[PDB]
């Protein structure tokens with residue numbers, strides 16, 4: 027008998043499932059509360075969907091509850107059982123109220139109807155509503171593939187919402203799709219269709235977030251980012267939320283406290299609005315998984331706006347601040363998940379008592395090649411492709427992680443011929459953005475479009491190139507896809523790319539545990555998804 031079952035991230039035990047404790051640190055009761063939360067969120071989605079079908083309004087507060095619930099269960103987001111149990115209660119209360127407004131209550135699922143206030147009852151329920159509750163291998167695989175894609179979609183939708191952008195069609199889809207994953211009548215064909223539809227709405231969510239980010243902070247532009255440090259106390263902001271950074275920068279103005287980015291906050295540097303704060307210093311360290319070392323050496327407080335937070339060492343736990351849907355028991359939390367005013371005064375005061383950061387490297391890296399910037403350079407890129415100066419683009423976007431095998435991505439990047447350009451987005455970049463790879467005709471050989479959500483820009487760029495070259499098929503561009511994944515935002519990016527018709531994606535360092543043999547076969551047969559081997563072998567085989 028397993029104490030838990032979770033297989034949603036790349037590091038899952040044995041590439042099969044975490045059954046005792048998560049490799050990420052997630053304890054079984056935490057896992058159970060997340061399972062209960064997803065269950066009642068799907069129930070809420072059914073009720074809201076039914077209300078929409080009856081012609082009844084569903085308030086945007088419900089949308090926010092759903093996206094917050096999903097995001098709270100993303101890998102490395104929230105380990106705080108008290109917070110998770112309260113989200114279960116909030117969700118039960120909300121769906122009971124919504125169900126009261128239904129004219130016809132027939133056909134409501136157990137998820138829609140079930141409630142508990144006591145944590146013990148939540149844990150008991152979790153035992154029968156987890157991944158393994160679906161007996162059929164393929165239905166299970168697709169249900170969870172969709173659910174994980176929906177988590178990624180919800181994260182991006184939530185960031186857009188934080189910046190004041192939401193689309194009824196997106197929230198309605200998310201809630202309908204969640205409900206469909208509890209509908210036992212849906213066929214495998216229905217679920218494959220829903221998988222691809224989820225990808226399509228993934229593009230929509232990424233487009234919305236792209237519009238929100240650029241509308242608020244400007245279009246990213248070419249930027250040199252310092253990776254060394256100054257001599258003032260600092261705050262290190264990590265995760266993805268740019269609105270949190272805006273508020274933090276405004277509040278640190280005049281204080282003598284500098285602000286540094288970490289992991290997926292690096293791309294904040296690329297936005298013109300943030301360049302106007304002189305105390306916005308560099309990017310410190312590498313991807314999320316090195317944070318037990320890098321948060322320690324940073325010395326100042328660290329603010330986690332989203333995942334990935336790893337269970338902190340006691341050495342720096344007292345200077346970890348979470349916000350939004352991030353949580354860890356014993357770590358201070360700054361309240362707010364809708365972009366409302368956040369008071370950073372305590373973190374700023376804390377920073378003044380800490381030593382300045384310990385430098386771990388110096389120099390600069392270049393980025394800011396999101397869609398507006400690359401389209402501004404399109405003629406020169408096109409000319410370089412036509413002349414043979416650029417023989418291939420390699421999309422190496424996605425997530426980094428702990429696995430030793432990910433040395434592959436560094437070695438692959440280093441071994442690429444010097445007539446290739448790497449396109450990147452997401453923290454996967456850290457496996458090769460500190461190498462000395464040079465340039466082709468002045469175009470850097472690593473073009474960083476931004477955060478994992480800025481994979482959207484890479485798709486926009488590919489589609490632009492398809493148009494300019496007059497190609498019928500996006501796959502006839504000189505682009506190889508060698509994508510690394512870790513968590514559920516990478517899942518929605520993958521589904522988005524598949525919905526756009528991108529084939530031949532090499533995904534690694536392993537393939538998700540949640541793909542059943544038959545589901546994997548469909549992805550191979552229709553999309554030619556593959557994995558990785560050795561860097562030297564793939565440097566030959568992939569081209």
Ligand code: SF4
Pocket residue numbers: 032033034035036037038039043044047048049050051052100101102
């Ligand atoms: S999030 Fe990943 S490492 Fe954590 S319990 Fe789930 S599969 Fe395991």
